[PDB]
Symmetry: C3
Subunit: 278 residues, 3 copies
């Protein structure tokens, strides 16, 4: 295997962007889908379709602008391993962002609650991840390493910025809420099918608190090239963890688990901006 992109392809995507928008983003935000009407909060919103973007994998848009005093770039729609993309395509935008000048990555996603304490609607702050595809070989850094981005063997034990995590628990308290900010381990599985009961039990045993099909690869790539990362999971569903229970996970409840729980998340992210140091 080999990454299709050369250092230069990245570099030429970045330049193209640098020249087609006067915005100079500092914070990249990678939202779910449902969990990002977050586009209206921006101001001076400039949109590019992925389709116009030299090299951009493949209705997918890059929106540049200003969230609450920070210059942002928001990916609206992301790529997934389950769509068939190799990981070096899934995480191509991350490297592009670094070269645009960005120094922080915020990632959000929807995920099934594995911890029996979580409730549909909860926001879980990501403290750590379990990269199960990565154990087998599906790590987005597989291949020759390019030292212009970062090291051969980057560390992930501190992927999720301790400072931003503290500031996120501050901010949340900064509005004394009906539920608290949750915290835990996000496990990535490839999907696109949902877990069996036995699989759920496997993931609870591994120590995971939430489960989804994304995020981890962008986080690894982000950290490889020196960005500060933090993120959240909107728990959209409690994963079925025993056999009598006749109820099921669907793409419908994940999507339709926008509502006040998703608006909550938008506003939370938008306030966070103020805790990101210039």
């Amino acid at each position: 295997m080999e990454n299709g992109y050369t250092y230069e392809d990245y570099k030429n995507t970045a330049e193209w962007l640098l020249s087609h928008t006067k915005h100079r983003p500092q914070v990249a935000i990678i939202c779910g889908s449902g969990l990002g009407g977050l586009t209206d909060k921006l101001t001076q919103a400039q949109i590019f379709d992925y389709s116009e973007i030299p090299n951009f994998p493949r209705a997918g848009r890059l929106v540049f602008g200003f969230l609450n005093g920070r210059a942002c770039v928001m990916m609206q729609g992301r790529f997934h391993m389950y769509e068939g993309y190799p990981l070096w395509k899934v995480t191509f935008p991350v490297r592009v962002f670094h070269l645009l000048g960005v120094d922080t990555l915020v990632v959000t996603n929807a995920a099934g609650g594995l911890n029996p304490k979580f409730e549909v609607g909860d926001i879980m702050l990501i403290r750590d991840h379990i990269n199960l595809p990565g154990f087998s070989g599906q790590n987005p850094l597989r291949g020759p390493n390019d030292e212009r981005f970062g090291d051969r063997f980057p560390a992930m034990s501190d992927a999720y910025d301790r400072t931003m995590r503290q500031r996120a628990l501050s901010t949340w308290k900064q509005m004394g809420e009906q539920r608290e900010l949750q915290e835990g381990t996000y496990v990535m599985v490839a999907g696109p099918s949902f877990e069996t009961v036995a699989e759920c039990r496997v993931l609870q045993k591994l120590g995971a608190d939430a489960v989804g099909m994304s995020t981890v690869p962008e986080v690894i790539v982000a950290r490889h090239c020196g960005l500060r990362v933090f993120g959240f999971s909107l728990i959209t569903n409690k994963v079925i963890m025993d056999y009598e229970s006749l109820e099921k996970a669907n793409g419908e409840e994940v999507l339709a688990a926008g509502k006040q729980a998703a608006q909550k998340l938008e506003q939370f992210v938008s306030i966070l901006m103020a805790s990101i140091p210039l």
Copy 2:
């Protein structure tokens, strides 16, 4: 990655079959190898070699006929990830079956007993699975989804039909047997080499009861497109679970673990037919 087949290739395999046999199967059966002399029980047996079959991966035969009052199609020999097939080839026949008109899938396989209660010879009824290749990306649905088959994000928490499971425990009692029908979680690993002792201990800890190298992908594809699924593992070997024990798993004992334990299985499947609703 991308599935090599288009909706049309399936469709043209099905039509070719619809026109070359007057049989109209309702139940697809996917047997092991050793565990399916089950071909003689059929009547009005019409055979096609895979080799004559427009598109069929690659001595492999589709046998059409009548098991105990049901119109069947029996795959004789299957494909495996360990032979090098991508999963979209392994599970191609499943989609073909759906379009032939089939509404039920019975899958059987040979597997090592992980549960220390099992004994060589036991039939384990499949209650659930742990799809370890699927955690990393080897899910046969990886790629663009085709809604003519089914949803983007199908559920697997109920893959193994509760009704058929109940009817299977009925039927077994319907002949008050020397051992009981076993029940549990089948875990798929890719192979083709057998597990170490430490690996066995891993799989026991995950909650698995039996282990093999097949089945799970056909089950996921079956469920993706609305079939009713049930299956069995003939436990052909107790997997070596500690270090003094000098005895070893071989392809010889799996094969030669036909005998009265495999005939038992044939007859069991053949009676089951009567519990499959028209």
Copy 3:
């Protein structure tokens, strides 16, 4: 998928080698990198670069010679899944070795200690492995099997020769050392990034004692074709197993964890030679 090499490519690499060196090796040694200045201990050292070697994947050298009374072949630098090589390239030299006449494989590697009893510097003798890439499909034997090498379904429950393990604990006692020879399960993960804390906790729970990114595939291929295998991990780092700890795994401490701990290892291997039966 398919292995790029045919039985003949192996065969022609071997012959080329058989004819370009009068050495006839019996023991293949596959060292780390840092953990093999072991080249000077050899005598009658003949070097080939990988680059001159018909078919050899891709500064990489095969060194032929004599360790302590045994005819050796030492791979200096190896291939890794994380560099992008498929496993059938990573393990190509192993098959070549078998055809050179070799009957034993010694493998060594650097690995993070998962067992809280290990200490940086410790040598762990490999008693077993957990091949996590192999669970998902990344097994170097994936594809049609070639019976000239070995069986379709080889066993790995005895991969790590019990005799050589006993002789290794003898030999170590044969110099009554400040720490003892450690022993345990090596788990392979693909890398190239290092584990999170949560991942470490996963691997401790699976029963693993050390973790690295190599070895397992060569061992599986070695055993597939009948070689005797034994190996070691030099524990170069204690893997970070809880969150307050601010210290991190780096490629620098792994490399610079040569020193007296690596010389110890060289000398240990060099004495071992005397326990390998002719």
